[PDB]
Amino acid sequence: TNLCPFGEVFNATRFASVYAWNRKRISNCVADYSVLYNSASFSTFKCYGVSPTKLNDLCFTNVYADSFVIRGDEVRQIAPGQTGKIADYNYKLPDDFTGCVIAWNSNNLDSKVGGNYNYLYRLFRKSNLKPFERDISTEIYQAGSTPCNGVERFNCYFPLQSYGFQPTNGVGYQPYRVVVLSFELLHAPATVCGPKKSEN
Amino acid sequence: STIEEQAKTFLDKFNHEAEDLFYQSSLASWNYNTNITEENVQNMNNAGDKWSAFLKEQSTLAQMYPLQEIQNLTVKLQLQALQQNGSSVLSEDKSKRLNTILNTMSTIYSTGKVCNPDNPQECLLLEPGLNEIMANSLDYNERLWAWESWRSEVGKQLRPLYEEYVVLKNEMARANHYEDYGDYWRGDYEVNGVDGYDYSRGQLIEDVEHTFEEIKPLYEHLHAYVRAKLMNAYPSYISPIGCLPAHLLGDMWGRFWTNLYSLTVPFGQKPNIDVTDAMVDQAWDAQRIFKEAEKFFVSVGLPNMTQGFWENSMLTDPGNVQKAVCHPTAWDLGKGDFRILMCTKVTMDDFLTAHHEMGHIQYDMAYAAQPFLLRNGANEGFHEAVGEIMSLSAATPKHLKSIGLLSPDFQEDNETEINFLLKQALTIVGTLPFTYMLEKWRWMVFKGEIPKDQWMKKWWEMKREIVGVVEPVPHDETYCDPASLFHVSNDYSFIRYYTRTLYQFQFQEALCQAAKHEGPLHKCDISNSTEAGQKLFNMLRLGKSEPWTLALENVVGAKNMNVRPLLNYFEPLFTWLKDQNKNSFVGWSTDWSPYA
Ligand SMILES: *[C@@H]1O[C@H](CO[C@@H]2O[C@@H](C)[C@@H](O)[C@@H](O)[C@@H]2O)[C@@H](O[C@@H]2O[C@H](CO)[C@@H](O)[C@H](O)[C@H]2NC(C)=O)[C@H](O)[C@H]1NC(C)=O
Ligand SMILES: *[C@@H]1O[C@H](CO)[C@@H](O)[C@H](O)[C@H]1NC(C)=O
Numbered sequence: 001t002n003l004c005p006f007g008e009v010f011n012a013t014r015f016a017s018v019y020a021w022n023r024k025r026i027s028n029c030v031a032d033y034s035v036l037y038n039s040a041s042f043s044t045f046k047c048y049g050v051s052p053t054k055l056n057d058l059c060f061t062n063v064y065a066d067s068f069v070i071r072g073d074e075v076r077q078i079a080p081g082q083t084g085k086i087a088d089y090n091y092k093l094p095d096d097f098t099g100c101v102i103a104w105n106s107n108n109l110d111s112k113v114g115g116n117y118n119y120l121y122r123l124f125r126k127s128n129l130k131p132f133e134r135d136i137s138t139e140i141y142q143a144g145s146t147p148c149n150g151v152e153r154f155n156c157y158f159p160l161q162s163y164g165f166q167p168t169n170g171v172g173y174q175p176y177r178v179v180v181l182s183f184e185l186l187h188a189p190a191t192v193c194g195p196k197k198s199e200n
Numbered sequence: 201s202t203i204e205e206q207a208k209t210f211l212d213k214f215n216h217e218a219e220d221l222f223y224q225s226s227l228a229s230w231n232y233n234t235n236i237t238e239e240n241v242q243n244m245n246n247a248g249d250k251w252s253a254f255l256k257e258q259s260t261l262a263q264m265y266p267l268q269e270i271q272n273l274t275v276k277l278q279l280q281a282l283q284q285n286g287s288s289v290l291s292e293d294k295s296k297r298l299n300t301i302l303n304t305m306s307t308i309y310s311t312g313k314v315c316n317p318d319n320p321q322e323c324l325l326l327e328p329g330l331n332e333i334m335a336n337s338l339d340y341n342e343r344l345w346a347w348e349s350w351r352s353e354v355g356k357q358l359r360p361l362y363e364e365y366v367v368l369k370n371e372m373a374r375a376n377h378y379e380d381y382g383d384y385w386r387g388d389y390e391v392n393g394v395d396g397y398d399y400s401r402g403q404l405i406e407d408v409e410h411t412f413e414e415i416k417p418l419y420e421h422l423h424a425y426v427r428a429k430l431m432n433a434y435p436s437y438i439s440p441i442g443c444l445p446a447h448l449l450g451d452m453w454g455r456f457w458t459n460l461y462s463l464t465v466p467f468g469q470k471p472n473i474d475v476t477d478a479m480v481d482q483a484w485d486a487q488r489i490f491k492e493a494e495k496f497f498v499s500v501g502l503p504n505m506t507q508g509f510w511e512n513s514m515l516t517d518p519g520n521v522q523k524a525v526c527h528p529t530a531w532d533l534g535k536g537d538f539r540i541l542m543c544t545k546v547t548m549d550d551f552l553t554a555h556h557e558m559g560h561i562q563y564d565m566a567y568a569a570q571p572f573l574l575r576n577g578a579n580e581g582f583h584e585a586v587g588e589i590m591s592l593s594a595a596t597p598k599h600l601k602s603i604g605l606l607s608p609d610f611q612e613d614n615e616t617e618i619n620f621l622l623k624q625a626l627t628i629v630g631t632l633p634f635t636y637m638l639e640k641w642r643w644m645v646f647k648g649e650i651p652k653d654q655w656m657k658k659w660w661e662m663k664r665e666i667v668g669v670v671e672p673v674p675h676d677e678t679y680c681d682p683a684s685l686f687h688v689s690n691d692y693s694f695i696r697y698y699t700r701t702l703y704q705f706q707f708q709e710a711l712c713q714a715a716k717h718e719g720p721l722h723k724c725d726i727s728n729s730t731e732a733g734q735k736l737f738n739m740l741r742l743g744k745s746e747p748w749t750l751a752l753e754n755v756v757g758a759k760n761m762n763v764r765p766l767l768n769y770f771e772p773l774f775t776w777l778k779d780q781n782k783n784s785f786v787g788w789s790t791d792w793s794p795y796a
């Protein structure tokens with residue numbers, strides 16, 4: 001009765017582009033974090049502000065699950081205090097992040113011979129994202145001093161680019177699926193508890 | 201926003217789009233080279249056409265960021281590589297013309313064939329026909345007929361085209377702001393705007409010339425030793441004080457003296473060390489060979505091959521399934537995808553090649569994090585120098601003992617080592633005057649310092665003067681003997697073989713210094729030395745982002761090409777050669793010729 005639906009998140013068929021990252025609220029359910037944490041599945045499992053092992057002993061007000069695909073060598077940017085194209089322009093974790101970043105190689109699912117180009121990322125932006133901000137706008141990015149209208153297009157750029165995932169790419173270029181679990185602690189009744197603390 | 205930060209935004213967009221498009225062409229080309237079919241030819245050319253067209257447009261766009269306004273030298277370098285114009289400076293009538301000259305010269309060479317004067321039906325091509333004569337024949341007249349027929353039948357065809365080629369190429373170079381086509385080629389070594397590491401195009405001529413002066417003693421002594429041995433093999437045909445006849449040198453040009461080993465081996469009773477039989481006894485296959493090469497790089501602190509390397513490489517001839525192109529090649533496709541294509545056989549030769557080729561892969565992997573256009577050797581001589589030092593370590597008896605291809609109770613004697621160093625020098629040292637002299641003739645022709653009616657006169661004057669080699673029959677200006685060699689008639693610069701050769705021993709000396717090697721340099725194995733691996737890696741990872749003078753200084757502690765490490769490698773042979781020549785003339789007189 002009301003076990004948290006992590007399978008809906010981790011085993012989801014479709015994953016979002018990182019610039020349009022998907023959020024799922026996790027509420028009113030028990031969560032065995034240790035079933036995930038003890039998985040040969042995951043290549044990254046890093047927690048911040050919380051101990052990965054004692055997760056089953058904690059309660060939280062709300063838990064959020066952000067999910068998206070990025071390049072293998074961009075996983076290091078899904079962490080507090082990072083910079084780079086993903087951290088600055090796509091998905092930004094705050095310095096005081098409490099939660100876990102989970103990632104696994106999805107070359108088998110998200111690559112394709114000739115290349116899968118259906119995943120995008122923001123390449124250009126006037127400024128950096130604030131933590132947990134999402135920008136899905138598509139205004140032309142102006143890098144010069146001349147404007148971007150309908151005759152002048154010099155030093156102007158469409159802001160989103162496609163990843164290109166071919167199965168033969170090296171590990172750093174292969175697609176990785178990412179789930180960021182946010183453990184939120186309000187002054188309010190908990191709704192998500194480990195198995196150890198199941199009597200709310 | 202400044203022109204520089206506009207240029208960096210343009211480069212961000214260039215890099216993302218370039219890497220994927222280059223990758224697709226790399227894939228198509230891979231598919232052809234591993235599976236020859238008409239269909240895959242088409243894919244390869246389609247993808248290569250798209251890549252070329254993309255580079256043409258990007259070059260046009262990059263032209264809008266003037267170099268004046270760029271401080272950041274990592275940005276300036278990328279822009280520099282993008283706004284090079286090459287043959288596009290020419291009109292399209294001239295550009296179409298020079299391409300025709302190029303393609304005619306190339307086809308005249310690869311289809312050139314000579315026929316028995318008696319029988320107009322027994323004909324030979326350069327490969328395998330003439331080369332086989334020039335490599336194995338001991339008959340003065342037959343070697344002479346092959347040497348002369350090639351140059352008179354193919355060379356005379358090339359002569360009018362090469363003169364025109366010089367004019368157009370020089371025009372291109374001037375419209376690209378170079379003095380002439382030679383100055384254009386020396387640009388690969390140029391460094392500007394990096395304080396204390398700059399290097400001018402003209403300095404290459406002097407540094408080549410100064411380093412050659414220090415190779416002359418070793419060369420002269422090798423020459424005199426070979427000359428005495430050749431008098432035994434061709435009794436009435438060679439003066440003990442004159443130049444070596446050009447058709448007796450073991451290949452069509454004397455480019456290497458490799459195939460004189462049988463005639464000049466110091467100690468014919470001592471067989472060379474060849475672990476081919478041992479590898480067959482121990483049931484080695486191609487996989488084992490490349491696993492051993494992988495072990496060698498890890499032992500010095502370098503990474504393993506990637507998982508993709510093992511899944512996607514072609515390490516053996518696919519034989520009855522597909523047709524493949526079997527030249528050993530190290531492929532850097534981009535996007536973390538590194539491969540080797542090699543039809544490996546279970547021989548000592550292929551064991552050593554695998555180390556060589558995998559050294560290219562190590563270079564490629566170390567500089568993958570550099571921006572796209574900076575992923576390359578620090579100049580045209582670096583990659584091959586990295587590959588060659590890997591064969592050096594891997595062929596030493598010390599190394600082969602360690603891996604169980606020589607018995608733990610094996611010992612190197614004086615005579616085998618001298619045999620080895622002599623063989624080495626015939627290839628490595630013998631090509632250096634050849635390579636220098638040939639390029640000097642081209643640099644001077646491109647500068648307009650040799651008038652057309654003296655092309656062959658000055659060619660053979662410089663052969664006699666610098667190389668110690670004399671034409672067996674006189675040749676007038678209807679000949680174009682330099683174009684009788686692939687690189688000349690196919691438009692490839694040649695000094696790279698000189699600079700790379702010096703680099704490789706500079707690298708080895710420094711790396712062996714770091715591994716605390718003791719004894720003669722030629723015996724050094726850098727395995728298990730992470731201090732040597734780290735010194736190499738500090739240069740490898742630079743790719744093309746730094747001056748080659750700095751990349752060199754990272755390995756060897758100096759900024760200059762330097763022949764002393766080469767001379768060091770050969771020191772035991774030098775002293776030995778000096779003793780052998782004690783009753784001989786050392787040097788030569790230009791005055792003697794076989795036809796005087
Ligand atoms: C390279 O050549 C261009 C001019 O050649 C044309 O443009 C190329 C991009 C290519 O498309 C060729 O086929 C064309 O023939 C030079 O462009 C000049 O740049 C200067 C600034 O330095 C500018 O003032 C001029 O207006 C340009 N001239 C023209 C005719 O457009 C460019 O400078 C050359 N690059 C280098 C490095 O020399
Ligand atoms: C995803 O599926 C596998 C097998 O189908 C299952 O064992 C695993 O626990 C699932 N993941 C989650 C988070 O439920």
Ligand SMILES: *[C@@H]1O[C@H](CO)[C@@H](O)[C@H](O)[C@H]1NC(C)=O
Pocket residue numbers: 235237239522
């Ligand atoms: C080689 O090309 C042929 C096309 O005729 C194709 O049938 C075959 O599958 C290819 N081999 C490989 C290994 O891709």
Ligand SMILES: *[C@@H]1O[C@H](CO)[C@@H](O)[C@H](O)[C@H]1NC(C)=O
Pocket residue numbers: 208271272273274275
């Ligand atoms: C050059 O630019 C790159 C990327 O913009 C930057 O990392 C580097 O610090 C810059 N170097 C200099 C000397 O400006």
Ligand SMILES: *[C@@H]1O[C@H](CO)[C@@H](O)[C@H](O)[C@H]1NC(C)=O
Pocket residue numbers: 499598599602603725727728
């Ligand atoms: C390197 O070290 C290992 C273990 O110390 C040794 O067995 C091996 O033979 C060494 N190889 C060389 C080439 O020194």
Ligand SMILES: [Zn+2]
Pocket residue numbers: 556557560583584587
């Ligand atoms: Zn090589």
